[PDB]
Design a protein around this ligand. Structure first.
Ligand code: FES
Ligand code: FES
Ligand code: FES
Ligand code: FES
Ligand code: FES
Lengths: 338, 338, 338, 338, 338, 338
């Protein structure tokens, strides 16, 4: 009974797999190799010649995990060396040395899948499928704004799927029950008028109450949220950002970024407050079952954001099965409520 | 190769899900909500307006577990409140308040399955399916006999199916091997004459040896045993009762009740002795594999009780698939050996 | 995508299930019963009348595990007694006493499968299927050579399949990467000429470098290796032997034997060195995925041994499905490279 | 720097060592033997001929712990049997059988200290020293009041000394900081007029605010509190009682009893609420150091109860060192504030 | 048999108690309060009005730990609030509010010891005793050098005393045995000429071999090391700094800082390499017993640094017992070898 | 209140510190070094030039534990190398190389205590003090008897002192209570006539009942027992031997040897039976308190062996304090009962 039966669409989006700090801590070299799991796939990350690559975590020779091998160099070029019989892979996933027969000549069969991989906002992003060429790395505002300061949090795992995490983050009606002593609900028992737009691959909506502020959401699909809070009294802004990464069928790894105006307060005060909130949501959201969004779930008027999110996920899931042009239309066609 | 392929029949019987004490200890309120699993189904128990209800542990809105919510009251009526967005359910499983849009009007889709649920012998019983209206809560003797005193034991889990637990409880031929230093076998190497009757939904049989006593069994199907021990010298009686609850495909939760004549002895002496016996049976019974009763198992003459138990289970399993009248006939038709 | 889809062939070979010491330590009696798992089957070992038998670990009466029962004797004959209702089994798996009705007469249905089982080199070997009568217990050299001394190591589990363990043991090209500070590679970047023969159920090959020695392999199929190391300077020999037992679809239990010329050195020095090597291989080999050999794996010239191993495994797997004569031909037909 | 340097006085009071239920659960017999520690002394409890005795947990023969032996009977008399060589002790601590030389005659040296021991309010009380004959078992009200119902809680350990636990229980000024979301402070920033009397071995005081109620304390020395709460609106009463047992120099074992008017509410609701309060106090009180009351601690006006408690403890500590008449005067002399 | 019997001298030096990051992570507020132990004393750290204070972790009222209370504010001034009855302390350790009697007037007895406390190099330093006014916060070079970048490592505990940690850090003769595969020894079997000076409270010495570099040590007493490594080929410098904090009689908490020229390498590569070295030293140094430096230890010529360190520690230990002028002379008198 | 206040005497006896197998397993080399504790002293064992030495586990340079260093060789001579700065010790405890200044000349201060150490019965024995030259390695019979076979068990720790272990091993009156279902008592309620002799450093006594056998004890002081069991029917003998090693003030390490006539039974059957007995004694003996033998313990007639054991221990303890001749007289003077 799940809404989103086919997951092929998710392969065409950029997903975060770890923070840059997490990547550099994964191996004593500071350059990997490191193992991550994305959409059920086991990937290896390694920094070769100052660029982080993402490849299949599976040597073509005898299937050892490259993520427990080592980054090594020859003639000023870096390679990912297998831990087992030492085959070396370059940034494109081509095996450039078989040490057992080094003269050579290396079969084209000796090659692993190499994937789109870029560092942005001090997070490592991977896109498994290039074919449809219409997705970009999720939007975050003010990372480079010199009036503000950034916290890139360590990532955290929830035992639910990424859709449940996104719908939790964009919902206010649960504050009275999940967050009663922690978060004030500025809309309780209200039905604010909220227009939901699709603009350039993003869900965009704005919430205003009837200290008070506005809530402006830019949400790169399928799993990101950029929440701009603008205070009414004064023009001070606060950005809370999260993206859920679809690790596998039962978990997601979540990346939080806090952007705030410079203040001489300890960063840990802001991180610990968000952790306190996260720890209130976590057991409620992990109790939701089945994990996958189900068609039988009952939506009411205040679930407009969630309904629009589910609608676009379903359409994207179907469009990707249809082919390149269907998908690109679904991603790129703007839809302004009116 | 299992004897009892279809489990639909089990839904029509009353099964114990927890003791009353267990239910009251599950939540600081003393009124739940509490989670239990019955026949693979996740249920929530809560005490609303002095009655314990059993419902599906799954909110209709976004599938959160109601069993981690709270019992709350409005205008003197109790409700089961979801932990996530606060929908309130009444004793019938109808949602009576959506706090996001409270004026209202609540869709009929906003409703969870509510099940038969009654407290008897300080145990909580649930029946998942009403349709065939021919089963009752298992028989226990002397709970209200003012000459005797009762112990309702905490329940315990065995990693086997409920049929294996029942056949273990009604068998004497294993005493010499499982219980040699603990229980005397009054029938060893004997073949006592035992008549097995079906009477009003119960297996009934009596065992007599050739301090000594008689063993009178009334066994409400599918998983209860009421064992009356009447001593020969004197007319003193002792009741040992158990029911196995079919939690899921690999475990059962077992409920023991001891009824004895008042004696000024500590209850713990009787409980600890039964635990000692249980701990001798447990690893032998949990070693039985496959867990499910298999058709290839070899029965001999002394397995008459077990064979009659398996026969009636198989007939009940088939009758329930056939329909209401077939099932009611199988449950209700008495069969006296002769 | 696995190379070896059908596993029926493995049933026709002798596999080690435990060392003799392991068997004697499994039960306070020193005679079992003991539980082992072979090819996914649960077996019971017990020593009855001075011979270790192997049978199905499943009583025919009510399916209790015989491996938690006891070896008992009646009239000078030993029996395997079930822990539950005491049925006694003889060395052939026939039930010889039902204590509930002992006079008697025991049904032929009351019988468990009994398997080939022999102790050799202080290891317990089992063969599940007799039908094709063409396999023998793997070859080990010098167990009885009075100039040498033997270590039969405790067995160890790796979380991989037995083929991966065998290919690891017969490969030198991984030394530079897995064993750099522990084992010298006598062939690095060389392509020694290696002839691989099939002789009397064994893969046989010899490796010579261009202290130095020769490496002479006799490898009883499907999973044994007898490695004779003969030093060039002097004629001193050292035997390293291993057999991988196919426990189940995700693990193998490995048996090592070291045979060396008598030396007044502590055996633990030799065992600990081999453990150090094993601990270097273990995480690399356990990283290989999928566990099962896959057809897509890329073999190069230096994998000749592994390729010949995979070839004969595939042929054996197909021959066994074809029937007795096909299998016997595959096992017994010698093939000398030329 | 501790206030109460000498602890001899504590030996002359009755202290609770376990609940009756705890005693009956300690051994499968329901009659002990059981081990407890009181004032650093290791004691054995056993029920012999329907009376629980307390003795030194140390056999006179070779110093084995009697608390791991067994209660046994001979000629209708119960004995405490040593686990080692079987010496039997009667209720007075006299050895009545040496099984190695049973004819006999038992030395008077073969004898263990036996102590005052009585069950009251379903709690086991022990008094180590009889000599001064002026102390009684602490006061609890309404245990036998048929309009009310009693909960005797399982005991709990805090890692502090018993004086700290008592002063915590009789203090309201910590509610705003330790219990802000749990307990309302009816006296915050007030200085109610409180008269503290010494009456018949008890500290007695009453607190009234300026639902509301009165707080009437009768506090048997050295470590008990009986708190009667009488509501203003209506005459309904609620009794909260606790006694701290001085286990050793770093811990106390605490006994709580709740007495309330009959109400058809689950007992667990009242127990769980008190546990919630206890869990707020526990880490704050366990942080107090040094554990022992120190002379340098700074008392203010609102510590009147604590100051009077410390005064009488110090006087009792000195009186006991002085002798029988000094102690009896300190215990028994009433002192009414005026 | 210990060299340094009297520890009073250590109270007069600045010791690091935690990194700034560690302090800010200790409490969700980012401002403490936090608990640390220095020279056996329990201290509380809290940030009040933008300055971190250090005080005795013991409320004057009833001895609760202030480190589990909270930083609170009144009328724009911050206070350290006790968790128990809410007494508030200012930066000088004076109690400024007793909430039970707030009008007021607070006794001078209501006061806790307040200690010297300053943040330098992103580390929190405490000096317990001011009296002799001749010590300063240890020397570290290049923290503010804009051509270089700094790593302030998390602190780590070793189960040894701080003298053993210092002597380990300033010694090269152990490299061949503790660090054979990790650190090259530039002086092995050499006796370089090393002059050891006392200059302004520092041990100063320089080591030169006969890539290569010079080793210039400035070592603020009693437990700091600033190691400047200047490469011969090129003038590039690398600073490795450590200070051992005397936590108690059996452990020290160690603070490492790495200063290096900017390089676009990941900081984790440098941290992980130092951890690898630390993990080689740790079990050897923790094996040294007795922990305290003993007079019987045998020094050879290559222990010149250690001998001079022990000499000055012994003299400082004696001078502090003698009085202010003796100590100030020992700390401040320069001694140039010649 | 302990009987044996002074422990100096124990230093003059040979004590077992580990089995030979235990020593060879302690380090991958098979030659140590290994750490043991004897009479509170930390010792290092290492095999140098085919002989195991015992020395103080404390390097003279900077007090590192030699037991975590390594056995190394130079010019065909073995040395114990310190893990810290590499000082090498020979079999006499003299430092023969300081690698920092190797030319040399090594101070006589650079030397560790070296102790008597010999392997006998595949056990490592150490004697800390030579001075009185009158003790030998405990007696065990039949180790070299070619009609019998030996089991040298792994050693085991009990949390009691060695005297309690010895008295437990030589006592039959506890069988009925500690071993009721495991060991038959051949003397229950009997007072067999037992003569206790002191012969050549041994307690010697023989016990005969009124399958049956004689029990002949030769007990080398202070802690060994050689029990010869000779069956009446037939002349078959069975030797059970144990020695308790005084590890420290709260524990002993116990060495068991079983010698039996050759029988084709598994050794594990005999070991497991003795472990079953040991596990019955262990919690009773560990309950004995105070651990040290106390003067107040009450001995009866059947404790004759224990009383004679305590007498000779007390005399030995006093004699050793008196001097060489007193001790030698106490050890060597035979005393035949008559
Ligand atoms: S598995 Fe990677 S080189 Fe062989
Ligand atoms: S999931 Fe229950 S109210 Fe939303
Ligand atoms: S120690 Fe109690 S009978 Fe011997
Ligand atoms: S202990 Fe700190 S306010 Fe009372
Ligand atoms: S401590 Fe042993 S060589 Fe320095």
């Amino acid at each position: 009974k799940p809404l989103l039966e086919d997951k092929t669409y998710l392969r065409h989006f950029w997903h975060p797999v770890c923070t840059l700090n997490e990547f550099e801590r994964a191996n004593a070299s500071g350059h990997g190799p490191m193992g991550v799991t994305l959409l059920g796939e086991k990937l290896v990350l390694a920094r070769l010649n100052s660029k982080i690559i993402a490849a299949a975590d599976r040597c073509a020779h005898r299937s050892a995990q490259l993520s427990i091998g080592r980054v090594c160099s020859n003639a000023g070029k870096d390679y990912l060396e297998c831990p087992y019989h030492g085959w070396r892979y370059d940034e494109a996933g081509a095996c450039q040395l078989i040490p057992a027969c080094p003269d050579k000549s290396i079969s084209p069969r000796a090659k692993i899948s190499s994937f789109d991989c870029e560092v942005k906002y001090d997070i490592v992003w991977v896109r498994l499928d290039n074919s449809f060429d219409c997705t970009q790395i999720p939007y975050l505002s003010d990372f480079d704004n010199p009036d503000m300061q950034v916290i890139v949090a360590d990532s955290y795992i929830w035992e639910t799927v990424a859709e449940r995490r996104w719908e939790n983050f964009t919902d206010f009606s649960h504050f009275a029950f999940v967050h009663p002593g922690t978060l004030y609900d500025p809309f309780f028992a209200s039905h604010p008028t909220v227009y939901v737009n699709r603009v350039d691959g993003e869900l965009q909506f704005k919430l205003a109450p009837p200290p008070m502020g506005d809530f402006t959401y830019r949400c790169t699909m399928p799993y990101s949220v950029n929440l701009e809070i603008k205070l009414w009294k004064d023009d001070s802004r606060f950005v809370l950002w999260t993206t859920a990464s679809p690790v596998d069928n039962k978990s997601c790894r979540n990346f939080m970024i806090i952007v705030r105006e410079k203040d001489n307060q300890p960063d840990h005060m802001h991180l610990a407050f968000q952790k306190r909130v996260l720890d209130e949501d976590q057991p409620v959201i992990e109790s939701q079952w089945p994990l996958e969004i189900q068609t039988s779930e009952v939506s009411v008027a205040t679930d407009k954001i969630s309904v629009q999110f589910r609608k676009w996920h379903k359409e994207l899931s179907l469009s990707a099965v249809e082919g390149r042009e269907a998908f690109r239309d679904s991603v790129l066609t703007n839809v302004i409520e009116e």
